[PDB]
From Swiss-Prot:
In cyanobacteria the RNAP catalytic core is composed of 2 alpha, 1 beta, 1 beta', 1 gamma and 1 omega subunit. When a sigma factor is associated with the core the holoenzyme is formed, which can initiate transcription. The gene is rpoC2. This is DNA-directed RNA polymerase subunit beta'. Belongs to the RNA polymerase beta' chain family. RpoC2 subfamily. It comes from Synechocystis sp. (strain ATCC 27184 / PCC 6803 / Kazusa). DNA-dependent RNA polymerase catalyzes the transcription of DNA into RNA using the four ribonucleoside triphosphates as substrates. It comes from the Bacteria.
Amino acid sequence: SIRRVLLERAADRLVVDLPSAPEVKPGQLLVAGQELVPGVKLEESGKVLEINGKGDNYQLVLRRARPYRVSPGAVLHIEDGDLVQRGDNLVLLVFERA
């Protein structure tokens, strides 16, 4: 019995238009703000799915992906593959509070 099923919305996908050949391959996780064109940087982070384009313009479709850094020594409550909800606890960090 399947607990959670996600549906990838079409509006949740972003399309990015650029006039030069990018530096990407399908399968790389990218952080927003870094270089795609000299002078142009993409505004929202995420993973690239497919590249469409030939000539003087490129169509770069996206899927939104927000990264989260974990500290060495953190207790992980979940692994990769299962699905999380909004506000769902994933990790526990150890720290010193003043």
